[PDB]
Amino acid sequence: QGLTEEQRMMIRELMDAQMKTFDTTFSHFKNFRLPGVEAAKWSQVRKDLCSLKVSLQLRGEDGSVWNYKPPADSGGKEIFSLLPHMADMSTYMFKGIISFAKVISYFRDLPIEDQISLLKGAAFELCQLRFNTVFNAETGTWECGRLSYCLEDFQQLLLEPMLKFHYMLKKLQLHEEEYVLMQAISLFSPDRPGVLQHRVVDQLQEQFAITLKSYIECNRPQPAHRFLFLKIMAMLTELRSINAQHTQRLLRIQDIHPFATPLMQELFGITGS
Amino acid sequence: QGLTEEQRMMIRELMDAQMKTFDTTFSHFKNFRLPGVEAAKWSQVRKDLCSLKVSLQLRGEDGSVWNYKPPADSGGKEIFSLLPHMADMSTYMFKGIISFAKVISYFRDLPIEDQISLLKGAAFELCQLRFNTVFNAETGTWECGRLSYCLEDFQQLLLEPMLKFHYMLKKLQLHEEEYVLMQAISLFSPDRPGVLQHRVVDQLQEQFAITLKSYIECNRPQPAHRFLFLKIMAMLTELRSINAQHTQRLLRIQDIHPFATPLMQELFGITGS
Ligand SMILES: Cc1cc(C)c(S(=O)(=O)Nc2ccc3c(c2)ncn3Cc2ccccc2)c(C)c1
Numbered sequence A, B: 001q002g003l004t005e006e007q008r009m010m011i012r013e014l015m016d017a018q019m020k021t022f023d024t025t026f027s028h029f030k031n032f033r034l035p036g037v038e039a040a041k042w043s044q045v046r047k048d049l050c051s052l053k054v055s056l057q058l059r060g061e062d063g064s065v066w067n068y069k070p071p072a073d074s075g076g077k078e079i080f081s082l083l084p085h086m087a088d089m090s091t092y093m094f095k096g097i098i099s100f101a102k103v104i105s106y107f108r109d110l111p112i113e114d115q116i117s118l119l120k121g122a123a124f125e126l127c128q129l130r131f132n133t134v135f136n137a138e139t140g141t142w143e144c145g146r147l148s149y150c151l152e153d154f155q156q157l158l159l160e161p162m163l164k165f166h167y168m169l170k171k172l173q174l175h176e177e178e179y180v181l182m183q184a185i186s187l188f189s190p191d192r193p194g195v196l197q198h199r200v201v202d203q204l205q206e207q208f209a210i211t212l213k214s215y216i217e218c219n220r221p222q223p224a225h226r227f228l229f230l231k232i233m234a235m236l237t238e239l240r241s242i243n244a245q246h247t248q249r250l251l252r253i254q255d256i257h258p259f260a261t262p263l264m265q266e267l268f269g270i271t272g273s
């Protein structure tokens, strides 16, 4: 609508990249693992697992249904039973994220070193933003095509920052264009560890944020959307904080129960030695 | 109680064999398959599958639970999805049945040719009799330890002869001793195909039936148990008929979708050529 030509083409490129690289039905997610058929650090692991307490459902192509109810925490390794499957899901999402960045002209024009630093910095955030678009806030369920992930037991759930983020972001009822602009702004973060072209990346980020702000002003006159751009920017700031918290959760769990795939090791800085 | 010494020792041997060879909790049933993640003969296959329309539940050692809801009949091969797992279950039960016969002195004293003919004749019947002792008639569920098999959809279910048999036999509220005597009588059937020692087997059967009849008269005075011995004998006659019906169902399904394990092939006469 009422944007500059540069702004409209910028949204069209982002929407084009999202359409090409986001398997919204998860049809190509296959071959994943499923759950099978000194102690002050350990209770920290119970805390480090809170955002992933889900049951799992598989609807088969034939119409069959498999449900998995996880074990209760009985003090043993059984809290790790879903981690292999989660690693396969996240890895699959991360490939989508990487493909998304590679399609964007503004991203492929950066030096490959900064491309790698930016993806290392933002992969978790873009993953969570994509998961929010399949999140059902009425049933607390991420609806991933034939897979469903439903939160286990009520409002003590919203004490987990990750889960409060998904419910709050869902409440804003964003358009597809606003989600993919959130992804652009998070991807082009000039202050990630190891970025060299600080100013180029920072100017790109500002252009994406200006586009987002202008999109909202032109297509959202309603008083419910007053300050909407500022709410989004505050959520992106919270999400970067959640990203730092969860990066540390992963490294702690990896330290005592290895599970990260090779791609997760690259993205989160695990060298293998 | 009030039986001869020969009769009491006969029950003690049968109970001893049952105790040694019947894994009532199914703890040693492992490594089984699970469902994955010209046309007048085909609708006969829908009929030939009626007694096995169950959903499946696995309680894990860790406290996790897996449930499988089968597909709806949509005209394709998806009605066969549970057959590999059923073959593994039946094979496992059949090994129990074979071990049971081998412990019994009266059985190991027959010529090995008649042993084989008797087991070929009775394996399905002894399997169904053992399954009845874990059948829950209130929920229509065979409760096999950590596995559960629950009948899919009400009283149209009791039109299936197998399922009417399990409900009716459960209603008689038999003791363990009466079940294992039912197994003896069915095992020692003088008129199975290929039995040579007709009279020896027939006299053994009569002794088992006399023992059963005397056990009921001595330990069951209540009017609800009037004619109980005759009800049991009528059920064993019905079960032999169900056995012949289901032997033909298996051979028909095997003919167009092979699934029988090697042990099932031996027991049901499939040569492999
Ligand atoms: C310990 C640990 C730390 C990290 C940091 C990760 S992860 O980035 O590789 N992926 C990831 C993916 C989804 C998540 C999530 C983390 N937390 C909450 N959901 C929400 C949800 C849950 C189920 C399905 C869909 C979405 C993993 C995998 C493990």
Ligand SMILES: Cc1cc(C)c(S(=O)(=O)Nc2ccc3c(c2)ncn3Cc2ccccc2)c(C)c1
Residues within 6 Å of the ligand: B048, B051, B052, B054, B086, B087, B090, B091, B124, B127, B131, B142, B149, B162, B246, B247, B249, B250, B253, B264
């Ligand atoms: C086509 C076909 C024909 C035959 C003849 C068999 S089977 O004898 O090898 N075993 C078998 C075992 C149990 C059954 C059952 C048959 N029918 C009803 N239940 C009841 C039940 C169902 C689930 C769990 C426990 C008990 C098989 C396997 C397939």
